[PDB]
Amino acid sequence: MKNVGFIGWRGMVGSVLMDRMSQENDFENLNPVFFTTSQLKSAFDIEELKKLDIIVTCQGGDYTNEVYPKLKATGWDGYWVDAASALRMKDDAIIVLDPVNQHVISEGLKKGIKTFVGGNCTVSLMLMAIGGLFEKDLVEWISVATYQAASGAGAKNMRELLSQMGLLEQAVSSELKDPASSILDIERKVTAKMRADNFPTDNFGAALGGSLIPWIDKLLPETGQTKEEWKGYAETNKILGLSDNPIPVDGLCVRIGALRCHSQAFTIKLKKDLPLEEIEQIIASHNEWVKVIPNDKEITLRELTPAKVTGTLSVPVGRLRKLAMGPEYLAAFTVGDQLLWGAAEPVRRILKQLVA
Amino acid sequence: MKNVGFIGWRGMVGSVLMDRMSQENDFENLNPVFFTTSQLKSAFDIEELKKLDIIVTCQGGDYTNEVYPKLKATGWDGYWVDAASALRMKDDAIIVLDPVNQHVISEGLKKGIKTFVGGNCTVSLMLMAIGGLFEKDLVEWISVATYQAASGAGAKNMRELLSQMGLLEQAVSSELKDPASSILDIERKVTAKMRADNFPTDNFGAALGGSLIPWIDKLLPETGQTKEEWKGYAETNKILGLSDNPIPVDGLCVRIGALRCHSQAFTIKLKKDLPLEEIEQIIASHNEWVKVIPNDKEITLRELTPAKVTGTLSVPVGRLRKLAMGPEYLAAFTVGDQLLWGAAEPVRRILKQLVA
């Protein structure tokens, strides 16, 4: 069995990885060595890390940027598996999402690539839902509008969202108890609390609770995009292996009041005019996790929501129809869990392949 | 002075209209006669309604479809102003949004049109923001993705959203107070509460607080669109007077956890390649309510959110840049209050013109 090092296993993404690995009994297939940054071996000890065959880290970019150059400088020929964004764009690294790019991964393992990194949450959840259209060379471009959860921002951000929500209802606790009260008065009090100084907004920089934030990560002055939006064009094409001739995937990334699921609204311009039934079969046949939801009200409310998909491996896609712009314009809406397919699952699955 | 009848003045839309009319001293220029459905004159007394010049109603479509044909059957030559969707698509009716379609209203007044109806909230808020692009005949098509507030569905829907928000936090109040508690444990509990039997989901048919619903209104079998989505293509073109040569406006209408502001994400395909600064000036110059928000983080978080715009007449539009698809593709994000420009304001303004 392989000797595997685990760093950042105590954090949010790391804990989801530990829980998933325990569920699938992945630990019986490898020899686990747990690391810690605390003053269990030290995560900064290159001499201990050098003994291992594979290193799995959910610690973050700052750690990766500090220890990865130092470790690869000793002549170490092992594998680096990362959940963080730091090494995604390097030429000796592959962005991993096996149900979509098993070919790129298999050909890369044959090429001697030692660094494997999980992809951007919104990109990976999009490809898990709409990868069938990419496989059959049907996508010309995709216009994206996201509904992102507090999960992607961090653990303290999820807690702030919850605190914000409770404070919004508390401001009108008494008024909500009697059915005869004025709704405009209720709203005036909820909005006043949202705008108050004592309303906890330090993690977001604005209220998320009964609002939204149409900006995620820093600005790239050259394009006007945010880093989260930029990753839609850059990472989709690297995963699929189309970096030399890219497919335009661009849009707006918005943070909404959800805990764990990222939802996305698409306007997909296809290369061919195809029947709607045929498009539904192309995306349903791609992988075992994608679930095509029929264009009906009761089934959409029950299946295509964060309430339904939180904590599951299911990637439902629905609202499938042709848009008024033309027969090659397809509407699609998807919901997926940020911590699983958007973070811990592509990392779990590549490890399984490496220890096989 | 003109004798004006007011029906549905005590409901949510009506109360906003009453407050706005009071703020602008609109009652000084007319003679108000208030009606009621309770057992003030009766709202169903056709003879009392006939004695009036103009009738402004916020009561709803069920009232209109009952009282309107009975009133027109007496030979009444007065004006009907409605906030309800019932008569929007009728040939003898005009949809009002004067800062965008004053010409259609002015020509309609001269032709002898007696019925003026307020438009669909999302369509109205979209046109208030990017009406400049439509004015200059620059729009080929628009793909929409909305972030709709609970006020669009009703007063009890807003109450249900708030009650839901409180229950989600109350489920983890001790854990949130504990700075060292597990986030995975916190999430497991709020998600369990969201899925519980006693969680209030009566008005929406699903959870909204901590989630979203990608379906608003009835299905339109012919296209696959929901009625809210259909109103995009149909109403934008009736407002602008372009029903003979329509501009495609289509997309996905999603309900999120906001109280009274609808936010919208667009991918606008323009007819010509124009510099960004010119497009920003074309958008800004259209009306005095639209506000172009520069593509900066601090300014976007402070200005382009439901938190900032709630209860105001301001219609901010930002995140303006060219998309990766090409220089004729424009990204834009807007936020607007549903009860004002999306409900009471276009009704308030048309009345002001009729009583002049």
In three-state form (DSSP H/G/I as H, E/B as E, the rest C), the secondary structure along B17-58 is: HHHHHHHCCHHHHEEEEEEECCCCEECCCHHHHHCCCEEEEC
Tokens matching residue B52: 């009036």
3-state secondary structure of A323: coil
User: Which chain B positions have a beta carbon within 8 Å of A267's beta carbon?
Assistant: 143, 145, 251, 267
User: Which chain A positions have a beta carbon within 8 Å of B256's beta carbon?
Assistant: 147, 212, 256-257
Same domain (yes/no): B289, B352: no
Which spans in A171-221 are helix H? 173-177, 183-195
> Residue B75: how many CA atoms within 13 Å on its side-chain side?
0
**Burial of residue B241, with CB atoms counted within 10 A of its CB: 0-12 exposed, 13-18 middle, 19 or more buried:** middle
Nearest chain B residue (CA) to A187: B259
Between β-strands A261-270 and A139-147, what pairing exists: parallel, antiparallel or unpaired?
antiparallel
Nearest to A260 by CA among A151, A109, A121: A151
- Report DSSP letters for A86-136, one per residue: TTTTSTTEEEE-HHHHHHHHHHHHHHT--EEEEPPHHHHHHHHHHHHHHHT
Neighbouring CB atoms inside 10 A of A110's CB total 8
Same domain (yes/no): A37, A126: no
Same domain (yes/no): B67, B195: no
User: Which chain A positions have a beta carbon within 8 Å of B325's beta carbon?
Assistant: 141, 143, 248, 250
**Bridge partners of residue B144, in order along the sequence:** B251, B266
Resolution in A: 2.0
Q: Are A165 and B167 in contact (CB under 8 A)?
A: no
Nearest to A214 by CA among B320, B187, B211, B128: B320
- Residues A52 and A71: their CA atoms lie apart, in Å, by 11
Q: Are A204 and A157 in contact (CB under 8 A)?
A: yes
Domain span at A65: 1-120+339-356
**Bridge partners of residue B54, in order along the sequence:** B4, B79
Between β-strands A41-42 and B54-57, what pairing exists: parallel, antiparallel or unpaired?
unpaired
What residues of B are labeled active site? 121, 262
Residue B250 neighbours by CB under 8 Å, 6+ apart: A323, A324, A325, A329, A331, B141, B142, B143, B144, B225, B229, B232, B233
Same domain (yes/no): A152, A253: yes
Q: Are B139 and B268 in contact (CB under 8 A)?
A: yes
CATH number at residue B109: 3.40.50.720
The distance of A198 to chain B (nearest Cα, Å) reads 15
Same domain (yes/no): B87, B74: yes
The tally of domains found in chain B comes to: 2
Same domain (yes/no): B29, B164: no
Residue with tokens 């009766």: B42
Kindly determine whether residue B267 and residue A251, on different chains, have CB atoms separated by under 8 Å: yes
Kindly determine whether residue B322 and residue A224, on different chains, have CB atoms separated by under 8 Å: yes
- Residues A332 and B348: their CA atoms lie apart, in Å, by 38
Residue of A169, A211, A301 lying closest to B306 (CB–CB): A211
The region that residue A14 occupies, defined by phi over 0 for left and psi between -120 and 50 for alpha, beta otherwise, is alpha
- The answer to whether A132 is a known ligand-binding residue is no
Tokens matching residue A202: 């330090």
Same domain (yes/no): A235, A327: yes
> Residue B212: how many CA atoms within 13 Å on its side-chain side?
34
Which spans in A202-344 are helix H? 227-240, 276-284, 297-303, 306-309
Nearest chain A residue (CA) to B141: A325
User: Which chain A positions have a beta carbon within 8 Å of B306's beta carbon?
Assistant: 210-212
CATH number at residue A201: 3.30.360.10
- Residues A101 and B282: their CA atoms lie apart, in Å, by 44
Between β-strands B54-57 and B79-82, what pairing exists: parallel, antiparallel or unpaired?
parallel
Tokens matching residue A280: 């539904």
Same domain (yes/no): A79, A45: yes
- Residues B339 and B334: their CA atoms lie apart, in Å, by 16
The region that residue A281 occupies, defined by phi over 0 for left and psi between -120 and 50 for alpha, beta otherwise, is alpha
Q: Are A10 and A40 in contact (CB under 8 A)?
A: no
Strands (E) across B153-260 are located at: 249-255
CA distances from B72 to A3, A313, B75, B113 (A): 85, 59, 5, 13
Kindly determine whether residue A307 and residue B210, on different chains, have CB atoms separated by under 8 Å: yes
Q: How long a stretch of residues is chain A?
A: 356
Q: What are phi and psi of B156, to 5 degrees?
A: -70, -20
Report CA A273 to chain centroid distance, whole Å: 31
Same domain (yes/no): A199, A319: yes
Tokens matching residue A96: 């991993």
Question: Breaks in chain A at C–N > 2.5 Å: after which residues?
Answer: 39
Same domain (yes/no): A150, A203: yes
Q: Are A8 and A58 in contact (CB under 8 A)?
A: yes
Kindly determine whether residue B252 and residue A233, on different chains, have CB atoms separated by under 8 Å: no
Same domain (yes/no): B245, B104: no
Question: Breaks in chain B at C–N > 2.5 Å: after which residues?
Answer: 39
Neighbouring CB atoms inside 10 A of B10's CB total 15
**Dihedral of CA A102/A108/A113/A119: which sign?**
negative
Same domain (yes/no): A145, A70: no
| Element holding B66 (H helix, E strand) | helix B61-72
- Residues A321 and A302: their CA atoms lie apart, in Å, by 19
- Residue type for B239, please? I
